[PDB]
Design a binder for this molecule. Structure first.
Ligand SMILES: CC1=C/C(=N\Cc2c(COP(=O)(O)O)cnc(C)c2O)C(=O)O1
Ligand SMILES: CC1=C/C(=N\Cc2c(COP(=O)(O)O)cnc(C)c2O)C(=O)O1
Lengths: 408, 408
């Protein structure tokens, strides 16, 4: 049952090195995660033994590669509990998945008077495609407001969503506040108003179980690179009845059935939405990442991260002059600022002690404006991090504070 | 100077195995190429040592990954002799690159009366995005006709292209006929009529030197998986003055400069066209494939493939009852049919002898209709193939012919 962190860290070769003469402390898994040998050796065995293009009815290596690629599609369907492989589309990442929904669903289903509803805590990937789609259609964009601790109340959702709302798009978990939003209840409110709900699951999928039947979301998007898998690949899930009626976002080989000089017809789902040679190795590697995380247990990973987040919030409250943003109940990250030290300089001095964090707006400029700052620092955690690494981070922040005070 | 094929094959681990009790003979590099250890160990060193998300001004591993990703962009610029890294955009593959030109350039620059000119030998990736763009704009699609040996004459180009033509899109090399089209002279004809030229370089880039300044093409697209590099990545080259005036195809983080609630502004080139976390490992691996092919020499690879194609065409002319399609002067592939044996069954029986070829329409249904067949078989070559492998293929075709005659 209970995960052993020593034995998990032993499977990630990149953790065992020094930076600037200190052991690496990597606390930037919300920007990207590190990979275990089970995934890296999956990519190696594919390119060393059975790489070939994918299709029905070809030679021996081509059949092995096709069985690998469509095998990985079934592992994804089981991992988020979708009803069918026709609802699982491989893309290059969360951002491309949400752009496909805005191009193929929203640009076809919006007209003047219609509304798209989003929230002030959304990442840019779940803001800009909607700004562009309402511009193209003459519709209206509206924002749900936040409570003072950076949570959403269902009363404010009901107030913002109306019978003119056609789409509500919302993060499952914020990559800055750590808030877990009440998606299942928000889906009920959208459906009761006649709208669909589009969920950005880039920060939830790596760190907690997803069940799209229980959430009842109409679309759900995620990225491999945040959940121990290769870069350059992601998924778009959509309910089959909505994908059946959407046109493709891109056109070419593999997604057609018949091509004449002027007109063509498309393949059935899910291939209708996969044009060209697919991301073969990366999707097979994402299937190996899923197998790896399922063998550990997503509920075990969630419980470890609950322990690390509770420990970090307590230890941050021990520091004078430090502000943390967002709620007490949260996922495994802390975004903060020191009084009087710019967050870029915090991240500079921490990297000189071996500690990797990120500073900036975290692709959420409207949220930074809501918080009344121009930038923040963020430490974010995953299954290979430990309480001793959080002690290193809070000791380094104390020394940073004393350093800049001495400078001034 | 002169390539040693023994020493090149020793670097591709996948070539050294048996299929169905016979040494593998892989003759399907136009569908995808195999990779050398220099590229596979590039991906391993990235995930074992320096994976992190990319950006200016971050921690030590993030700086190494950013220097790797933008380093690979400069290797691509030098490899096709573009003037600037602002003209080199990383995408998921040729098909996505041509869809970006059709969405962001053609849908903005076509109106009724305007024409897009293509050719009957084009792959579907360079047909369907134009069918869709002329549909959206009310413009007209026109085809340049072919000569009887599957070449294009510059007189027919001048006849088809007019002062109402705005875009000419054409393959550099056909993945079925093996024809090398006269792109530099076609670009002159397009420009003299007021049009831009879009070149599909998926089959030329792996196998011959590309110089986009000498070709004077306005856009050029290519795929990593055909040129010894990872799956899931490709390039779109465009002249800087045309990209500056095109809007992005996808929207999100990394491609913005300022994001307000309703309106945003974009980053400079090339990042304006790269939304979200990039294909970090795959682009670094494509840079290693470029370094590998440059150390061998693309002119040396082209000369090897000229020798293999001349040898194969002679040996095919020794077989009774076999038709080869396309011209005598050609790239390194042969597409053919046996009289009275369906090409699917040819590829079935060849794979039982260890030999991998492909049968079907090769994503070029209008060309198969021009050729008056419904499908063909294709053997295609690259730097690791040899004359002995072509002998195996022609001996297996003789035995296939005798087999089916005996059956009947
Ligand atoms: C460098 C960086 C990207 C980050 N976010 C990825 C992301 C994305 C974009 O995913 P991507 O297309 O894989 O970059 C969308 N929504 C949420 C909630 C995200 O966390 C981040 O937090 O730090
Ligand atoms: C399975 C298969 C794909 C093939 N073609 C890739 C290709 C493509 C599409 O490139 P992709 O997006 O990498 O699949 C466009 N133009 C030409 C001339 C091509 O050769 C092929 O010949 O066999």
């Amino acid at each position: 049952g209970h995960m052993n962190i020593t034995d998990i860290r032993e499977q990630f070769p990149i953790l065992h090195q020094q930076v600037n003469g200190h052991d690496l402390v990597y606390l930037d898994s919300a920007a990207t995660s590190q990979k275990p040998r089970a995934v890296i050796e999956t990519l190696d065995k594919y390119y060393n033994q059975y790489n070939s293009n994918v299709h029905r009815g070809v030679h021996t290596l081509g059949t092995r590669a096709t069985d690998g690629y469509e095998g990985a599609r079934e592992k994804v369907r089981k991992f988020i509990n979708a009803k069918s492989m026709a609802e699982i589309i491989f893309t290059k990442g969360t951002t491309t998945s949400l752009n496909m929904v805005a191009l193929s669903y929203a640009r076809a289903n919006l007209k003047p008077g219609d509304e798209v509803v989003i929230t002030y805590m959304e990442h840019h990937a779940n803001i800009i495609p909607w700004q562009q789609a309402v511009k193209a259609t003459g519709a209206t964009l509206k924002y749900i407001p936040l409570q003072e601790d950076g949570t959403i109340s269902l009363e404010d959702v009901r107030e913002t969503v109306t019978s003119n709302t056609k789409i509500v798009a919302v993060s499952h978990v914020s990559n800055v506040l750590g808030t877990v939003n009440p998606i299942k209840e928000m889906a009920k409110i959208a459906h009761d108003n006649g709208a669909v709900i589009v969920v950005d699951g880039a920060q939830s999928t790596p760190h907690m179980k997803i069940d799209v039947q229980d959430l009842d979301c109409d679309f759900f998007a995620l990225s491999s690179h945040k959940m121990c898998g290769p870069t350059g690949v992601g998924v778009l899930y959509g309910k089959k009845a909505l994908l059946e009626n959407m046109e493709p976002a891109e056109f070419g080989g593999e997604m057609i059935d018949f091509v004449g000089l002027y007109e063509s017809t498309w393949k059935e789902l899910p291939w209708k939405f996969e044009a060209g040679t697919p991301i073969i190795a990366g999707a097979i590697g994402l299937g190996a990442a899923i197998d790896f995380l399922e063998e550990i247990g997503l509920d075990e990973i969630s419980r470890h991260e609950h322990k690390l987040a509770a420990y970090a919030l307590e230890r941050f409250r021990q520091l004078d002059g430090v502000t943390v943003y967002g709620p007490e109940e949260r996922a495994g990250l802390v975004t903060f600022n020191l009084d009087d030290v710019h967050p870029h300089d915090v991240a500079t001095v921490l990297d000189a002690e071996g500690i990797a964090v990120r500073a900036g707006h975290h692709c959420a400029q409207p949220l930074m404006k809501w918080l009344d700052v121009t930038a923040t620092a963020r430490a974010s955690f995953y299954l290979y991090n430990t309480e001793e690494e959080i002690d290193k981070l809070v000791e380094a922040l104390q020394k940073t504070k004393e350093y800049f005070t001495n400078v001034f």
